[PDB]
Amino acid sequence: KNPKSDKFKVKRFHHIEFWCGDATNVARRFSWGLGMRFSAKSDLSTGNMVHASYLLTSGDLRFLFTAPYSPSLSAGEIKPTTTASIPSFDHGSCRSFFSSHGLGVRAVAIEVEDAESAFSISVANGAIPSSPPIVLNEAVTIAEVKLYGDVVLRYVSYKAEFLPGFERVEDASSFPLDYGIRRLDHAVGNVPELGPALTYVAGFTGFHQFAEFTSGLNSAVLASNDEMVLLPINEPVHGTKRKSQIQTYLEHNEGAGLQHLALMSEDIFRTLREMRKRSSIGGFDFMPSPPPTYYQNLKKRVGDVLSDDQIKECEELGILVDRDDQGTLLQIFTKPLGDRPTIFIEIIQRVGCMMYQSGGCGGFGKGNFSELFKSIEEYEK
């Protein structure tokens, strides 16, 4: 069921902002590893004395990387005279975030009809305010509320190119890399307590429950009216024979935070060929592949959806496949993006639910816990 209970008009995921120690090095690593183009900047060269911010894009996917400069560069500024392009930025908050959590997502940004009304309605319905609505160059409004941990949900609304004060990048520095990634599919948080987390976020957004599951974890998915904004949340389950990976996350992250970003590809085969070619030359590593028993069992499970050759290509690339009563999901997971065993990336492509494709088509891979464990037991034999 979809009660379509959003308390304000939500459009799509807009961008993800990482808080970094050095934005330059993280942005360049991510650009090469994911095939994203350097598309906009706000830094000393654009008159920003406060923070360095670099925007990468692939299709509709937008990753922003931000780090603070020395506060001495802007010591005489006040908020009414700031040279920062992102008004919510604060030197101390950014340094405290990075010192506590390491590299990670500070902001999950969604485009809304009206960021001022989204903020006001959210706070009226229980959201903890983080940054009030600010109008930039009479063209864009930005506001932020607490999502979980030190992650904020950022609302952006446009009157009528990323943000005022950002400059488009010189084409020489903008190499047109593209490995097929096209948009953010879902963004997943880890929290100590799922119930309170869900009650809080669904309380101020009106997002409805899309899915739920139970492994070492319990999860549920919150969704916007058209189910294009998807926010799953996990909690650890204690008492299992193996330690919860959610609990390991919370320990190494110093608490709740964003666990993974799932990035939709228009051609997951091409994306994984390109990413795997670069794993050991500056890119991203992938989790160990399933045993060949997993791919033998795939023919029995999705042989009507994928040809034998298409299943062989999944096997070559380490791609996992799960299936709904409605759709089929192709997915694979990276190793952690940085030093700590915390945030990682998922690459996904969905088959089915054509109407445009409906959001969440095929689910989130819950069937691959059992199928993988079973295939692992079969391979040892």
Give me the residues that bind ligand KWI (CB under 6 A), please. 186, 188, 219, 221, 232, 234, 260, 287, 320, 333, 346, 364-366, 368-369, 372
Main-chain phi, psi angles of 199, to 5 degrees: -55, -40
Q: Quick one: CA torsion of 112, 117, 122, 125, rounded to 10 degrees?
A: -140
Name the one range near a copy of itself by CB under 8 A: 8-16, 37-45, 318-326, 367-375: 37-45
Buried b (16+ CB within 10 A) or exposed e, 291-327: bebbbebbeebbeebbeeebbebbbebbbbbbbbeeb
Site string for a copy of itself, 277-316 (x = CB under 8 A): ---xxxx-x-------------------------------
**CA–CA gap between residue 40 and residue 54 (Å, rounded):** 6
Contact flag: residue 102 with a copy of itself (CB under 8 A): yes
| Strand blocks (E) in 137-205 | 140-148, 151-158, 167-168, 181-190
15 is in an annotated binding site: no
- 231: β partners: 222
If one asks whether residue 373 binds a copy of itself (CB under 8 A), the answer comes out as no
Question: Strand pairing partners for 135?
Answer: 141
The CB-of-121 to ligand KWI minimum distance in angstroms stands at 26
Which CB sits closer to ligand KWI, 149 or 365? Answer: 365
36's CB contacts (< 8 A; 6+ apart) are 30, 56, 57, 58, 61, 63, 177, 181
Nearer to ligand KWI, 186 or 208 (CB): 186
Determine the residue with CB nearest Co ion. Answer: 262
What residues does 313 pair with on adjacent strands? none
User: Binding partner of residue 265 among Co ion, ligand KWI, a copy of itself, none, CB under 5 to 8 Å per kind?
Assistant: none
Token pair in block for residue 83: 């040279």
Q: How far apart are CA 212 and CA 8, in angstroms?
A: 24
Per CB under 8 A, the segment of 107-115, 117-125, 252-260, 353-361 that binds a copy of itself is 252-260
Q: Binding residue per annotation — 51?
A: no
Residue 368 contact among ligand KWI, a copy of itself, Co ion, none, beta carbon within 5 to 8 Å by kind: ligand KWI
Residues at the binding site for Fe cation are 186, 260, 346
Binding footprint of a copy of itself on the chain (CB under 8 A): 20-26, 28-33, 38, 43-44, 52, 67, 69-70, 72-73, 95, 98-100, 102-103, 172-175, 177, 251-254, 280-283, 285, 337-341
